[PDB]
Amino acid sequence: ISFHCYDGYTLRGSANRTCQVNGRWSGQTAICDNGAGYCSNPGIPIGTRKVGSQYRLEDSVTYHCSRGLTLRGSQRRTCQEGGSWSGTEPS
Amino acid sequence: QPWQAKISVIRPSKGHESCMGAVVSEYFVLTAAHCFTVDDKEHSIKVSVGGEKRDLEIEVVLFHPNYNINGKKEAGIPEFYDYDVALIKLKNKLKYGQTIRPICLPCTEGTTRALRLPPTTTCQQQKEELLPAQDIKALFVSEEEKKLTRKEVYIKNGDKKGSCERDAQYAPGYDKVKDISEVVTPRFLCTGGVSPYADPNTCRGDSGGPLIVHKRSRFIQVGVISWGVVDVCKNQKRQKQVPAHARDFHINLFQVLPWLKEKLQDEDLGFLAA
Amino acid sequence: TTWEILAVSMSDKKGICVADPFEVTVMQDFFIDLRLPYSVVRNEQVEIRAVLYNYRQNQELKVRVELLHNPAFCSLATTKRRHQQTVTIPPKSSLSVPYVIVPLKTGLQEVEVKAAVYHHFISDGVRKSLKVVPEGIRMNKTVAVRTLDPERLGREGVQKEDIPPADLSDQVPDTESETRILLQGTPVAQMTEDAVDAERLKHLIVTPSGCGEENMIGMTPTVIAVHYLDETEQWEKFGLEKRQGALELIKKGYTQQLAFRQPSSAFAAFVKRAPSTWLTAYVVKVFSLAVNLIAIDSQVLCGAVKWLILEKQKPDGVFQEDAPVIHQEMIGGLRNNNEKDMALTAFVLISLQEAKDICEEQVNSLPGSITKAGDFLEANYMNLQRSYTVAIAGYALAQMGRLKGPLLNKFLTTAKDKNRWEDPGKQLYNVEATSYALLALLQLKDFDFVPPVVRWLNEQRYYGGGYGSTQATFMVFQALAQYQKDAPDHQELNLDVSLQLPSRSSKITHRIHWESASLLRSEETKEN
Amino acid sequence: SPMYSIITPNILRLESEETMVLEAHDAQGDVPVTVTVHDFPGKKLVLSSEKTVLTPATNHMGNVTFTIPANREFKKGRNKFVTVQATFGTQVVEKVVLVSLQSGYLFIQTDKTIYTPGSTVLYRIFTVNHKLLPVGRTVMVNIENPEGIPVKQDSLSSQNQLGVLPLSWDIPELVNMGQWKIRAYYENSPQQVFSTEFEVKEYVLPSFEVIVEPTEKFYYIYNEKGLEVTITARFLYGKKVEGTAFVIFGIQDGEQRISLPESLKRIPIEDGSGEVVLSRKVLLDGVQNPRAEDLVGKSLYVSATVILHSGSDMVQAERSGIPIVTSPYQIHFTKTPKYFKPGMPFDLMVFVTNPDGSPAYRVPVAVQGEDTVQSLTQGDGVAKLSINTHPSQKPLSITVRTKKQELSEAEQATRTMQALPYSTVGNSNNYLHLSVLRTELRPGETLNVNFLLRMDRAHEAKIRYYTYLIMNKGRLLKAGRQVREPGQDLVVLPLSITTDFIPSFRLVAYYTLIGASGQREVVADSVWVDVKDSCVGSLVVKSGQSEDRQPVPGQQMTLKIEGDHGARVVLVAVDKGVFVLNKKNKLTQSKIWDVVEKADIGCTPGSGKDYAGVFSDAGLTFTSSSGQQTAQRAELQCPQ
Ligand SMILES: *[C@@H]1O[C@H](CO)[C@@H](O[C@@H]2O[C@H](CO)[C@@H](O[C@@H]3O[C@H](CO)[C@@H](O)[C@H](O)[C@@H]3O)[C@H](O)[C@H]2NC(C)=O)[C@H](O)[C@H]1NC(C)=O
Ligand SMILES: *[C@@H]1O[C@H](CO)[C@@H](O[C@@H]2O[C@H](CO)[C@@H](O)[C@H](O)[C@H]2NC(C)=O)[C@H](O)[C@H]1NC(C)=O
Ligand SMILES: *[C@@H]1O[C@H](CO)[C@@H](O[C@@H]2O[C@H](CO)[C@@H](O)[C@H](O)[C@H]2NC(C)=O)[C@H](O)[C@H]1NC(C)=O
Ligand SMILES: [Mg+2]
């Protein structure tokens, strides 16, 4: 499966990803960002769902996994001063 | 700022050149290439680090092969700060202390760990990390009344990059440049201005200094303070009335890697192939 | 639904073109329509409706719809029980299935309803998100509204301003809140006086003719006219296109004036008459102004300058008149002999400084001569009596920046009612003197004392021209034209506002400029 | 005595190529020409210099084009001019011309028409010149909140981007509801600002749409039947709606509405259709004014509301601005010239429209003066009339009416205009008229331009040629000659219409001779002509599928795109449920030409008060060495 970004948006991360035998997608998470916020777009790891579009300072986001799947990492990440989301990327 | 290096040059009555650099290894000191000239001999160039009173004796100054500041006099361009980088190989090995430490350089195994990336990280991936497509938050060290102080700035690498580059037309001499892209090569990072914030402007004495990105409790040099559009610095204070087009340009280290990787090969910095 | 695709082509050859909308309908025989509100209040029991459509032409469907469990909601559906009904949907019809739930937590939550038909390979599900706004009401307290303006309410150029924390005493329990800090520049454009209408100057276009002096008197009204119209840009109302006819007159008079240029690079009424120090210096004044209008020979322009410096100049820097012009009316306020050393030395000195940028390469003794004359005028400026001399001399010192202290105080107080430098007798001498003073003010950049002066000249309606008006014409329009360039539209707009929050390590620095003024610059803070 | 003339547009444009027509009457052999353009005021040289030689092999016409800076020397208020100069060997002819700071056109496109707080606005800026072509320019972009205060501003550049600037703005969760605005402009033209609006509001897309189309696009006052309105409601996927409808009426006169509580109805919606009527009784009873003619001019508005039997969705619709006119038609002389030639035929461009503004197809029109002289209105809503004029210098007054059968004279429309005589140089009664067969012109066809002359045989043998100039989008598309032998009162011009003439083009023709006592006389005339307004090239979007049935949620479908070669195609798909809440500010090709045409340097539909007037009114500046020059132009936009 391959990923593509709308106009005015830059793509960082694996453009093409392949479903491997370990039940995981190859490469890194695809993220379509416009680089217009204090912090960059945290992205939406495959299999999860992000709640929070504002990427200002002090802002936050929350991730939820599909039914039957367990979330690894942080479920909530806050944009900290110095351009860097707290916690770690979900999975 | 242990990596901070203070470079001075003595010239026959002409005056003294005041630049800065960074300690990248036990022998080398990365700085700007316009701080020196082919005429300046080693005996007239003194480098001081760690705040030590004494001056270190240099062995040789390595300019970048493509550095030609006068390669535009025909087109009517007096200055041409393209590939404005140089290394200073010391005559003595530096003893790393609490005042003297190196600063991380792009595309090195040592930097990968600093960013906490997998060892299998390619050079290209590091650039996407350090210099993403946005307004990257950075900083540089300036001299404030014989006292070093940091200055936080924003590298306009996003969509504001265009707004920042074209402002080079206001710079002295460039006023009659046909294509502004002819004086701002892809080897330049742009900082300063009013958007998204009011960034501090680099001074003449800060020229050659490191453009640092503080991430995850680690400092990574990604540029060398080359030249600014407006000279707000004037050994009396800082021109409290800075224009909106007062931009500052630097040298993107990811653009002179071949030269760095080569000259520093015997420094155990572990540069990445790519 | 039906998607409306819209295409826009851009050809470098053809051009731009937006195509006609292309619609694409996307329907299904059996589907679920889960319509949810924009937002719902927490803890308040609401009802959502699930409409199961059945567009099968002739066949009823035995469906079984179910609502999935969600900890963020409170329905009859638990983790171990399935809240599911079984209904029969007639052909070409629909059915609504009621669902009662209660939002247990705020934020964007997920609702999902599935359904499958019996005895068929048909099924469908819908998963949408609904907002859960906390119970209460959207309020907004204006903490404060300060005015930024160092100097007026500042100190040493800086201005500190504390801002008390928000009240929020009656805030709803367990709810967020953001403080919206906001800056904006406020222009502030003012001043500038009206310029004299070009329509009032349809008589200054005179054809230069006569002897070495009568030629200059006829060339002056034309040169200073075009010069005033080029600045104020009033060629539209004046006539336009007629400017070409005015230029040929300036060039015509220029060439004629050369016929009265003696080999000594000086000038006089006739080629036989003794050289005149004043007329020669005056020629430099006019020529140095018409350099932007026509082609002026540097050999001639600098020739007259060198003649004044080397020949007609004492070590004192004083310039003396040997052969006064026959036309004592074109010399303006110099006809009166009270203080001729201070008046003539200044008059000639000005002509040199207005040609300094031109004769700075050919005449090496210029910067020296300029300094000499300046030293003499600065020694007798405190002894002057007539308001006229005080002006013409003050403007000469102003161009050097040597008009400070006592000398500056006298130049300002000399003006009666702080709007004119007048002397008992004649009009020519009053308008001319005031014009010199105005040029001196514009030189000192004191735009606080200027408005009254400029307004006075305007409220006196002097359109030049006439007998002996050579000096009053060239000077009054030279000063008013200069005022139209040194006149700002607004005042300085460069605010360096920086706000430091206790919850933040670094300051938030902003800079407001004139152009970027009136710009909404907000910094949000989820913390009070 | 040789005469050298020069013709350039009233206003010169920066960073473009303005055409310049050179002529010489008559002289012989070769004649070198050195065109030099300076600034103003002052002879500050040089902006653009060109050269050319007029050879008798080309009938003494030259095609020289120059490109004006493109200089930072052109920087508030007032206007800037340039000294356009042309030397014909020795005789120098000069003329000052106005300069426009306008760079070109900017078009802003937004995916949706309305956005919810939290979403992102995807918009694109198109950077074209004064010819609608891609170009690399620096553009300033602002974003004003509903209260007109900028919240974000950037400085982009379409350089190396092919005249397309992809952009986006993130809408804060805590944002201000209302009509937001995206303003933009070229850096070299801060005054000329382009803008597009988009609504920010909390909403949810409906499941079906609602339409309210009255039986007529207006209402006749004395119509006892009343106002019958149809209520069509169907789902977004085509199917028909089953529900109830609440319809009400009201009157609008000014920026003020007056509801009619008495006109409330509740009609059923079966098979996705309904029917409601507004009794004339309730209408008149709505107000209170005994007279019914006082309602003439006012308008009615309908407010419908459909509700499904499931009570799951509810949509509100509205049809406002229903003209209550006495005559089902209107007449406008906006396309007809305001100047006539004594004795010569005077043509009229009658513009018959409907109460709403839409063109009226096939509508008989005639003049109070002569009967039988009629002409059925075409599809474009334009008729072709032509009345005879007397040699008198008395102002001409025309009154055109509608001989539409099936309608009394009391229910017909009427309009009256006034034309003025064409002043003659020396009263020599020398005129010129350009009659053109009024038919819908289309790219690729051919148009016959007629040159009708009027003068005594005393000097008719001196008229050996005319000089026609094609005006288009504010530039010189082409300039040629039209031969003529002594005795020919009417000649024809084989004009080929291409894609360039789009959307509209003006045609000016002038002839010069030494008739009368002995003095270079000039006579000219202009005529505006519309062309089938459409895309210069082409762009189609049809389905790739082999027809078949309808797609299914989550299916692949082919999308065929037929456009021009090497062209860039930017796409966008929008749910029709969106336009149900807002269908305004949609980017359309018709709206593009609208901007182009509403920017012409010409004002008068044709002809003028004299020879130097026809030029200025058309958009040209005639200047010669004999003395005859056109009027001065200071204002940028047309008068009034
Ligand atoms: C994600 O997948 C696509 C599909 O492969 C990648 O685009 C492809 O780029 C490659 C390298 O240029 C192209 O390979 C071509 O294969 C044909 C086969 O005959 C050969 O004739 C060409 O010489 C060439 O080797 C391929 O055409 C192209 N696919 C397209 C344009 O449809 C893309 O790079 C991948 N994204 C990543 C991983 O960054
Ligand atoms: C806080 O700000 C809001 C939004 O500006 C204010 O809401 C006002 O309410 C009126 C009611 O008629 C509406 O027209 C507008 O939404 C707002 N009015 C204007 C013009 O500001 C609100 O008043 C403010 N504070 C309060 C009392 O809630
Ligand atoms: C422009 O200059 C030349 C004459 O020197 C002509 O331009 C031609 O335009 C026609 C179409 O009308 C083309 O077929 C020719 O190819 C063009 N010439 C060239 C050299 O390409 C014409 O006389 C002038 N056109 C205008 C603007 O009137
Ligand atoms: Mg048309």
PDB file of C-alpha atoms in Angstrom, chain C residues 114-237:
ATOM      1  CA  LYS C 114     -23.691  -2.619  12.193  1.00  0.00           C
ATOM      2  CA  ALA C 115     -26.437  -4.596  10.462  1.00  0.00           C
ATOM      3  CA  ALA C 116     -26.785  -7.774   8.407  1.00  0.00           C
ATOM      4  CA  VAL C 117     -29.688  -9.317   6.500  1.00  0.00           C
ATOM      5  CA  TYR C 118     -30.849 -12.913   6.936  1.00  0.00           C
ATOM      6  CA  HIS C 119     -30.502 -15.510   4.178  1.00  0.00           C
ATOM      7  CA  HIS C 120     -28.370 -13.140   2.089  1.00  0.00           C
ATOM      8  CA  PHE C 121     -24.768 -12.033   1.556  1.00  0.00           C
ATOM      9  CA  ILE C 122     -25.642  -8.457   2.501  1.00  0.00           C
ATOM     10  CA  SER C 123     -24.489  -6.275   5.395  1.00  0.00           C
ATOM     11  CA  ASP C 124     -23.323  -2.760   6.234  1.00  0.00           C
ATOM     12  CA  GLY C 125     -21.810  -0.693   9.033  1.00  0.00           C
ATOM     13  CA  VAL C 126     -21.329   2.978   9.861  1.00  0.00           C
ATOM     14  CA  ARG C 127     -18.655   4.550  12.055  1.00  0.00           C
ATOM     15  CA  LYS C 128     -18.862   8.295  12.693  1.00  0.00           C
ATOM     16  CA  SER C 129     -17.528  10.653  15.359  1.00  0.00           C
ATOM     17  CA  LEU C 130     -19.564  13.065  17.487  1.00  0.00           C
ATOM     18  CA  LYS C 131     -18.264  15.873  19.695  1.00  0.00           C
ATOM     19  CA  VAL C 132     -19.027  15.884  23.418  1.00  0.00           C
ATOM     20  CA  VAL C 133     -19.081  19.430  24.790  1.00  0.00           C
ATOM     21  CA  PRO C 134     -18.891  19.682  28.607  1.00  0.00           C
ATOM     22  CA  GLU C 135     -22.005  20.831  30.464  1.00  0.00           C
ATOM     23  CA  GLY C 136     -22.148  24.582  31.028  1.00  0.00           C
ATOM     24  CA  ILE C 137     -21.814  27.619  28.777  1.00  0.00           C
ATOM     25  CA  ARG C 138     -19.171  29.224  26.558  1.00  0.00           C
ATOM     26  CA  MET C 139     -17.965  32.372  28.321  1.00  0.00           C
ATOM     27  CA  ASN C 140     -15.081  34.799  27.828  1.00  0.00           C
ATOM     28  CA  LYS C 141     -13.729  37.303  30.353  1.00  0.00           C
ATOM     29  CA  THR C 142     -11.695  40.255  29.098  1.00  0.00           C
ATOM     30  CA  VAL C 143      -8.795  40.260  31.557  1.00  0.00           C
ATOM     31  CA  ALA C 144      -7.335  43.593  30.463  1.00  0.00           C
ATOM     32  CA  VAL C 145      -6.724  45.921  27.519  1.00  0.00           C
ATOM     33  CA  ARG C 146      -3.486  47.890  27.829  1.00  0.00           C
ATOM     34  CA  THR C 147      -2.033  50.481  25.453  1.00  0.00           C
ATOM     35  CA  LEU C 148       1.518  49.976  24.194  1.00  0.00           C
ATOM     36  CA  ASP C 149       3.523  53.153  23.595  1.00  0.00           C
ATOM     37  CA  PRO C 150       6.981  53.596  25.163  1.00  0.00           C
ATOM     38  CA  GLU C 151       8.055  57.241  25.608  1.00  0.00           C
ATOM     39  CA  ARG C 152       4.525  58.487  26.315  1.00  0.00           C
ATOM     40  CA  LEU C 153       3.927  55.968  29.104  1.00  0.00           C
ATOM     41  CA  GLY C 154       7.365  54.373  29.043  1.00  0.00           C
ATOM     42  CA  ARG C 155      10.694  55.022  30.747  1.00  0.00           C
ATOM     43  CA  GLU C 156      14.209  54.955  29.297  1.00  0.00           C
ATOM     44  CA  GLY C 157      12.441  53.633  26.205  1.00  0.00           C
ATOM     45  CA  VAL C 158      10.974  50.549  27.868  1.00  0.00           C
ATOM     46  CA  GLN C 159       7.499  49.818  29.222  1.00  0.00           C
ATOM     47  CA  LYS C 160       6.599  47.130  31.756  1.00  0.00           C
ATOM     48  CA  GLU C 161       3.015  45.895  32.059  1.00  0.00           C
ATOM     49  CA  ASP C 162       1.676  43.295  34.499  1.00  0.00           C
ATOM     50  CA  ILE C 163      -1.481  41.331  33.701  1.00  0.00           C
ATOM     51  CA  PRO C 164      -3.525  39.812  36.573  1.00  0.00           C
ATOM     52  CA  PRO C 165      -4.623  36.157  36.207  1.00  0.00           C
ATOM     53  CA  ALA C 166      -8.158  35.423  34.989  1.00  0.00           C
ATOM     54  CA  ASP C 167     -10.981  35.086  37.513  1.00  0.00           C
ATOM     55  CA  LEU C 168     -12.509  31.769  36.424  1.00  0.00           C
ATOM     56  CA  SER C 169     -13.878  31.307  39.944  1.00  0.00           C
ATOM     57  CA  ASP C 170     -17.215  30.071  38.585  1.00  0.00           C
ATOM     58  CA  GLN C 171     -15.567  27.677  36.130  1.00  0.00           C
ATOM     59  CA  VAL C 172     -17.141  24.293  35.391  1.00  0.00           C
ATOM     60  CA  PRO C 173     -15.346  21.446  37.215  1.00  0.00           C
ATOM     61  CA  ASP C 174     -12.944  19.369  35.101  1.00  0.00           C
ATOM     62  CA  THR C 175     -12.836  21.632  32.039  1.00  0.00           C
ATOM     63  CA  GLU C 176      -9.979  23.197  30.076  1.00  0.00           C
ATOM     64  CA  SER C 177      -9.504  26.888  29.287  1.00  0.00           C
ATOM     65  CA  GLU C 178      -7.181  28.945  27.099  1.00  0.00           C
ATOM     66  CA  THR C 179      -6.048  32.544  27.526  1.00  0.00           C
ATOM     67  CA  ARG C 180      -5.751  34.415  24.234  1.00  0.00           C
ATOM     68  CA  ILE C 181      -2.995  37.028  24.371  1.00  0.00           C
ATOM     69  CA  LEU C 182      -3.218  39.396  21.412  1.00  0.00           C
ATOM     70  CA  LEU C 183      -1.139  42.196  19.872  1.00  0.00           C
ATOM     71  CA  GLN C 184      -1.728  44.648  17.024  1.00  0.00           C
ATOM     72  CA  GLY C 185      -0.072  47.764  15.626  1.00  0.00           C
ATOM     73  CA  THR C 186      -2.033  51.011  15.478  1.00  0.00           C
ATOM     74  CA  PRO C 187      -1.206  53.545  12.698  1.00  0.00           C
ATOM     75  CA  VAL C 188      -1.173  56.737  13.148  1.00  0.00           C
ATOM     76  CA  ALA C 189      -0.526  58.409   9.775  1.00  0.00           C
ATOM     77  CA  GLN C 190      -0.704  62.219   9.994  1.00  0.00           C
ATOM     78  CA  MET C 191       0.506  65.642   8.789  1.00  0.00           C
ATOM     79  CA  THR C 192       1.720  66.999   5.419  1.00  0.00           C
ATOM     80  CA  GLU C 193       0.462  70.320   4.018  1.00  0.00           C
ATOM     81  CA  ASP C 194      -1.230  70.989   0.680  1.00  0.00           C
ATOM     82  CA  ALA C 195       1.024  72.037  -2.195  1.00  0.00           C
ATOM     83  CA  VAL C 196       0.392  75.032  -4.454  1.00  0.00           C
ATOM     84  CA  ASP C 197      -1.830  74.118  -7.407  1.00  0.00           C
ATOM     85  CA  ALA C 198      -0.018  74.037 -10.749  1.00  0.00           C
ATOM     86  CA  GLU C 199      -3.028  75.810 -12.254  1.00  0.00           C
ATOM     87  CA  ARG C 200      -1.824  78.926 -10.432  1.00  0.00           C
ATOM     88  CA  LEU C 201       1.546  78.738 -12.189  1.00  0.00           C
ATOM     89  CA  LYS C 202       0.687  79.060 -15.883  1.00  0.00           C
ATOM     90  CA  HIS C 203       2.729  82.263 -16.109  1.00  0.00           C
ATOM     91  CA  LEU C 204       6.111  81.072 -14.849  1.00  0.00           C
ATOM     92  CA  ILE C 205       6.807  79.593 -18.283  1.00  0.00           C
ATOM     93  CA  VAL C 206       8.867  82.505 -19.605  1.00  0.00           C
ATOM     94  CA  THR C 207      11.164  82.436 -22.639  1.00  0.00           C
ATOM     95  CA  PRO C 208      14.676  83.441 -21.481  1.00  0.00           C
ATOM     96  CA  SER C 209      16.138  86.359 -23.441  1.00  0.00           C
ATOM     97  CA  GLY C 210      18.315  89.425 -22.929  1.00  0.00           C
ATOM     98  CA  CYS C 211      21.832  90.222 -21.743  1.00  0.00           C
ATOM     99  CA  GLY C 212      23.894  88.253 -19.231  1.00  0.00           C
ATOM    100  CA  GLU C 213      21.472  89.304 -16.498  1.00  0.00           C
ATOM    101  CA  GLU C 214      18.158  89.676 -18.330  1.00  0.00           C
ATOM    102  CA  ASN C 215      18.594  86.085 -19.522  1.00  0.00           C
ATOM    103  CA  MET C 216      18.828  84.659 -16.003  1.00  0.00           C
ATOM    104  CA  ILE C 217      15.799  86.658 -14.878  1.00  0.00           C
ATOM    105  CA  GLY C 218      13.799  84.996 -17.647  1.00  0.00           C
ATOM    106  CA  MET C 219      15.251  81.528 -17.113  1.00  0.00           C
ATOM    107  CA  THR C 220      14.540  81.423 -13.377  1.00  0.00           C
ATOM    108  CA  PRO C 221      10.711  81.379 -13.502  1.00  0.00           C
ATOM    109  CA  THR C 222      10.814  78.352 -15.826  1.00  0.00           C
ATOM    110  CA  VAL C 223      13.458  76.257 -14.067  1.00  0.00           C
ATOM    111  CA  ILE C 224      11.940  76.501 -10.585  1.00  0.00           C
ATOM    112  CA  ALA C 225       8.491  75.832 -12.047  1.00  0.00           C
ATOM    113  CA  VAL C 226       9.280  72.520 -13.734  1.00  0.00           C
ATOM    114  CA  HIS C 227      11.234  71.615 -10.601  1.00  0.00           C
ATOM    115  CA  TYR C 228       8.162  72.147  -8.422  1.00  0.00           C
ATOM    116  CA  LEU C 229       5.874  70.219 -10.764  1.00  0.00           C
ATOM    117  CA  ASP C 230       8.220  67.234 -10.948  1.00  0.00           C
ATOM    118  CA  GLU C 231       8.099  66.895  -7.160  1.00  0.00           C
ATOM    119  CA  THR C 232       4.432  67.586  -6.444  1.00  0.00           C
ATOM    120  CA  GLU C 233       3.503  65.687  -9.613  1.00  0.00           C
ATOM    121  CA  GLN C 234       0.849  68.143 -10.796  1.00  0.00           C
ATOM    122  CA  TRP C 235       1.547  67.960 -14.533  1.00  0.00           C
ATOM    123  CA  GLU C 236      -1.874  66.343 -14.882  1.00  0.00           C
ATOM    124  CA  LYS C 237      -3.913  69.365 -13.798  1.00  0.00           C
TER     125      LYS C 237
END
